[PDB]
Structures are given as C-alpha cells and as structure tokens.
Amino acid sequence: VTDEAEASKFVEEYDRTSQVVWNEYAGANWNYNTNITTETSKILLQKNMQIAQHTLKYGTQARKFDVNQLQNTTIKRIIKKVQDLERAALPAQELEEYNKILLDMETTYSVATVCHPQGSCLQLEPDLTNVMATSRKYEDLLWAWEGWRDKAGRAILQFYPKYVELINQAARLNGYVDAGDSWRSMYETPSLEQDLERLFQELQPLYLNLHAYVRRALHRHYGAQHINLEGPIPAHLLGNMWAQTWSNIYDLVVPFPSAPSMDTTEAMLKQGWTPRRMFKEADDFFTSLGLLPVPPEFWQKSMLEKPTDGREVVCHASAWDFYNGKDFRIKQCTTVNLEDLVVAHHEMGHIQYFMQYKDLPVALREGANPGFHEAIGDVLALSVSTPKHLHSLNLLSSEGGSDEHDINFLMKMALDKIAFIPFSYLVDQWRWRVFDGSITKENYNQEWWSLRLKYQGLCPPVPRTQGDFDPGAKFHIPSSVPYIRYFVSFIIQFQFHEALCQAAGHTGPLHKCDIYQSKEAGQRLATAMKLGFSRPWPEAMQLITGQPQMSASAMLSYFKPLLDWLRTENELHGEKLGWPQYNWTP
Numbered sequence: 001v002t003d004e005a006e007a008s009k010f011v012e013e014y015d016r017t018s019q020v021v022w023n024e025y026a027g028a029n030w031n032y033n034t035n036i037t038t039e040t041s042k043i044l045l046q047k048n049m050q051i052a053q054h055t056l057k058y059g060t061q062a063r064k065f066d067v068n069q070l071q072n073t074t075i076k077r078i079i080k081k082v083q084d085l086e087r088a089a090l091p092a093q094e095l096e097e098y099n100k101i102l103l104d105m106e107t108t109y110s111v112a113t114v115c116h117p118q119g120s121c122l123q124l125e126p127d128l129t130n131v132m133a134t135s136r137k138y139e140d141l142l143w144a145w146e147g148w149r150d151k152a153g154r155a156i157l158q159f160y161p162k163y164v165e166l167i168n169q170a171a172r173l174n175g176y177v178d179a180g181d182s183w184r185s186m187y188e189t190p191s192l193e194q195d196l197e198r199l200f201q202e203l204q205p206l207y208l209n210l211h212a213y214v215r216r217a218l219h220r221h222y223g224a225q226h227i228n229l230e231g232p233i234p235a236h237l238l239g240n241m242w243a244q245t246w247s248n249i250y251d252l253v254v255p256f257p258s259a260p261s262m263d264t265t266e267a268m269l270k271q272g273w274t275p276r277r278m279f280k281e282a283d284d285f286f287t288s289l290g291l292l293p294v295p296p297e298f299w300q301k302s303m304l305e306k307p308t309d310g311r312e313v314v315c316h317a318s319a320w321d322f323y324n325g326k327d328f329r330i331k332q333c334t335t336v337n338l339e340d341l342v343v344a345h346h347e348m349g350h351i352q353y354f355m356q357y358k359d360l361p362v363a364l365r366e367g368a369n370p371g372f373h374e375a376i377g378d379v380l381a382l383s384v385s386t387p388k389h390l391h392s393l394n395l396l397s398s399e400g401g402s403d404e405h406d407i408n409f410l411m412k413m414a415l416d417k418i419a420f421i422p423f424s425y426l427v428d429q430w431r432w433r434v435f436d437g438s439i440t441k442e443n444y445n446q447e448w449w450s451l452r453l454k455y456q457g458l459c460p461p462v463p464r465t466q467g468d469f470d471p472g473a474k475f476h477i478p479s480s481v482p483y484i485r486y487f488v489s490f491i492i493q494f495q496f497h498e499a500l501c502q503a504a505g506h507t508g509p510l511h512k513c514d515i516y517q518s519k520e521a522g523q524r525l526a527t528a529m530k531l532g533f534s535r536p537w538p539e540a541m542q543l544i545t546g547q548p549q550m551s552a553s554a555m556l557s558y559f560k561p562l563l564d565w566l567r568t569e570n571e572l573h574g575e576k577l578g579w580p581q582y583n584w585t586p
C-alpha cells in the first residue's frame, strides 16, 4: 500500500525534475552540435555533470525500491528503467574522462577534412559524399575513400580503446556484462541474436543476386582488370562512402535503359526546391495521413541546412526532443536531391514519434524499441519514392507503367533497401565483439574487414595497415550510437508498409502502393506510436500489422518481382553467386 504509494510518488517527482534537467541538457547539446566551439563544448561537458548528478540521485533512490513486489505495471517499468544509471554509474573521475572522450570523438569526426596538396579541402557533407555519389572514375573515388579514412578514421583510433574500457565499465556497474549486452537489452528480447540472424539469412538469396548483378555491371564499366566476377566488390565503387546504400550507381546498373528516366535532382533544383520545401513536403505527407503537423516553433529553431556563417557543425542528420512536449527540432545539412528528401522524411518520422508520445512520462518517451523509431519516417518515404508519387510532385514526366519501368523501380529501391541489410547487420556484430572483448584493439580493423567481406562481399581498394581504423570513419562509431536499430528498421518498415497499404485498401503488387492521404494508414501508426516505451514492443507490432513478430516476409513480397528477374538475368550470364575467391582484392 504505502510501498506502492512511495513508488508512485517517486515516479511523479522523477518526471517533473527529469523534464527540467533533460530539457536543459538538450539545450546545451544542441548549442554544441549547431556551433562547435570551445565555449559550447565547455558548457556541454558541464551540463554532463548536472544531468549525471540528477541521474545518480534518482537512480540511487530507484534501486532502493524492490520493483518485483510493486503491483502497478507502468510504475514498475519506469522504476526498473531509472535504476539504470548508464554513464552516471562511473566514479566522478571516470565519468569526466568518458564524457570528454565522447566529445572529442564526435568533434574529430564532424570537423575532419580531406585536402588536395596546395588546393581544396573537402568535408564529408556535402563534398566527399557528392564525389562518392557522382564520380565514375576509379582513382577519384579511391582518393576520397582512402582520404576520408586516413583523416577521420585514423584520428579516432587514439580514443577508441579507452572509450571501450569506460563504456564497458559503466555497463558492468549497471548490472550488464559489457556495453553490447546493455545495448541489446533495449529490445527486451532474449532471442534477439538468433531472431536477427534468421532475418538476415532470409534476405541472402536477394542480396547475393543483387550483389552478383551489380558486380557484373561494375565489371562492364570499370574493366575486367579491376573487377573479379567471382570475388568481393571494391568497397569504393557503390556510390556511397560506406557502400551501405547503392542507389547512386543506378545509372550503371539500369535493367532497362530504354525506359523513361526517373532522375529528380535537376527537376527539384529547376523547380526551386529548397531544404525548407523538402521538410514542408514531409510534414504535408504526415498530415495527409491524419497525423500531427510539426509546431510553428519547429520551423523557427531547426537547423535545416549547413550554416554559411562559418559555424562548424555536426552535419550528420538527427531529430531532437527537448522534453517539454512543445520544442522538437531537426539538425540536417540538407542538400536538394531525392536521397536527402528520403533522409528528411526519416528525420520527420522521429519528430512525429516525439509528438505522438509527448504526453507519457519522460521515462517512457521512446520507440517500442529503437527499431521502430527508425522505421516510421522510412515507411512514408517508401510511398514518396514511387514513380506515381514522384510524378505527382512534378519531379517526373510520367510514372510509367511498363513492366520494364517497373523492374527499373524495384532495382533502384533494392540498391538502397537490400544492399543495406548486410551493412546494417555487420556494424554491431563488430561492436558487440569489441565490447565483449573477443576483438582486441590490435585486431579492430582486420575484424572489421573480415565482416565486410563475409556479410557484404566487399574488399578494400587499397591494403589496410597498422594505424588504420576504418570503423572510425562511420559516424555511429565515434558518436557511440547503436546500429542494429537500422537493421531492424529496414525489415519492419516493409511490414508496416504492407500493413498500412492493406489498411488503405491497396490491391495488387505491394511496391505499387502509395499511402498518401490515407487516414486509415495514419491511424494504424498513431495508435502504436502513442504507446511510446510503455508496452513490450510485440504489442505495438501487432497493433500495426496484426501479428507480433519481426518478419522478412513483407520485404521479400515487396521485392519478389525483382528477385525473379535477377535470378533469370544472373543465370543467363552464368553468374556465380557469392565470392568464392573471397581472398581477392583489386
């Protein structure tokens, strides 16, 4: 009775105070992210001590409650969560050192540049990413690929071993075995590893076929002397810095070159699209579903484009919740092209989620699981990418209809959606093994590439050496942001697309579905999002789809036509799926 009452009272206080403290912290973190300076860094590190103080205080009190003797389900869940102090469990000295290391890694990544002797210095966004996406010259791609790793990657190495030591220490102090074990607990699912492995295995026929097909095309453009038709693909040729998405080399793999084009950049530019207009369109798609519009304040405080006042900023896109239920922002160095419009939708998906669960106790303001949070935005972007919708935006002449234009579309989608499966799976497999200690610092890079070869069928264009730390050249590594969430997202977003389309009355091939304006679709998601982190995620999964598991079925259904086409096309050329000569390197 009174224990239950003491618990209930504790949660209420934790909420009121956390809102204030958390809001304050977000403010300083935002000031640092949109203006990297010595002052803002100082203020951020100091705010780290403030929020840590609050976290230590309430966490300690939370641990005195005996959760598993508390009646109410919502309060028992909140208190269990508060008992996890995360970084605040570290002794004062280790905390300050850990906080600095995280700040230093993030800054190093976000300010790194690759320069030409006595010429121009390029930044990742938008310079280097543009080169990786548009250059079709082996040497130019190589320069940007190797340079980005020399400058950003190598620069993170000095910090990573201490970072692993400290984040692991914190996890242990919180009852976990290592940091990887702590990250996985976010999905409250004992069978997570096996469940993910199975999903990955299911998308292997599709990936191997896409892989073999793309390899053949790269062999055509880059020469037989540079592409082994039975080996891994040079990692700097896929149109993206980390070869995580391949749509930027669509021009080199177009199944039916005769079909009506679907380039939209020149159209977006000519028709005066701007970052602003790009986010407005995402907002309109959301409201078209009967979902929430971003607040007037969003447009006033967000950083929707890279500043031109000489401010140094963290360009990697991110959505921000300031924990007051009114202030939400996006910080994106937006460029005008379809690929970034898709990123804009992704970010807006996070914002929608913030607005949907804003009225829940701050402890429960999270996605059912990190995967869900990443998926929302992507679901709508699937509809936006269809020829039909792009045409309705005037970015396309026609939407086609021909089976050829149809295979071309699935191919462009697969270049991003399917190629991402093994990359997204790989990242944390590497980290979990780094966190559990099976991969020591002397083996960081070698193990990374063993995974790059094993899962993606990729090989580095130039031998790696002692001092290289390629993982460091990928944002989430130095920023300490879990990655398995994106793997889950990519699987489940198709399950959601499939459910929202059925709810919208769509009939026929799933890839032809566009939920724009469907209030039914909007309601399916809203009900699930409002739950925040209050219930086990399988409940949110069922509300949306009707079943409670993760499943690759939706994604396979979406790509079935392409799989069949790829099979026949690859067998016609007698392609050997996989990379037997796995040891080959350009």
Ligand SMILES: *[C@@H]1O[C@H](CO[C@@H]2O[C@@H](C)[C@@H](O)[C@@H](O)[C@@H]2O)[C@@H](O[C@@H]2O[C@H](CO)[C@@H](O)[C@H](O)[C@H]2NC(C)=O)[C@H](O)[C@H]1NC(C)=O
Pocket: 008, 009, 011, 012, 072, 073, 074, 075, 360, 361, 534
């Ligand atoms: C278990 O408690 C939850 C939460 O109760 C609220 O938070 C407490 C700390 C205290 O401030 C209570 O007075 C609050 O009501 C109950 O769920 C809430 O129920 C109210 C009214 O039905 C609703 O408006 C809230 O949105 C609910 N919040 C959540 C997170 O669901 C719940 O009813 C209690 N369960 C039982 C069996 O009593």
Ligand SMILES: O=C(CCC(O)(O)[C@H](Cc1ccccc1)NC(=O)c1ccccc1)N[C@@H](Cc1ccccc1)C(=O)O
Pocket: 244, 245, 316, 317, 318, 319, 320, 343, 346, 347, 350, 373, 374, 479, 481, 486
């Ligand atoms: O990194 C992102 C988008 C950034 C983000 O929106 O996921 C962002 C990352 C981040 C940044 C700083 C601190 C923590 C995480 N996450 C969020 O904005 C976010 C995440 C959870 C809750 C609320 C906001 N996407 C991945 C995968 C991806 C997804 C979709 C298209 C392309 C690529 C990538 O680019 O490699």
Ligand SMILES: CC(=O)N[C@@H]1[C@@H](O)[C@H](O)[C@@H](CO)O[C@H]1O
Pocket: 015, 325, 358, 359, 360, 361, 362
């Ligand atoms: C608009 C508003 O007051 N929303 C509050 C929210 O901030 C708080 O976290 C929650 C407590 O669970 O109660 C809601 O009513």
Ligand SMILES: *[C@@H]1O[C@H](CO)[C@@H](O)[C@H](O)[C@H]1NC(C)=O
Pocket: 035, 037, 039, 040, 309, 311
């Ligand atoms: C950037 O931060 C510094 C440090 O506080 C401050 O002097 C400057 O005014 C800020 N610039 C902007 C764009 O607000």
Ligand SMILES: [Cl-]
Pocket: 242, 470, 471
């Ligand atoms: Cl790499």
Ligand SMILES: [Cl-]
Pocket: 183, 186, 370, 371, 482, 483, 484, 485
């Ligand atoms: Cl995650």
Ligand SMILES: [Zn+2]
Pocket: 346, 350, 373, 374
């Ligand atoms: Zn995200």
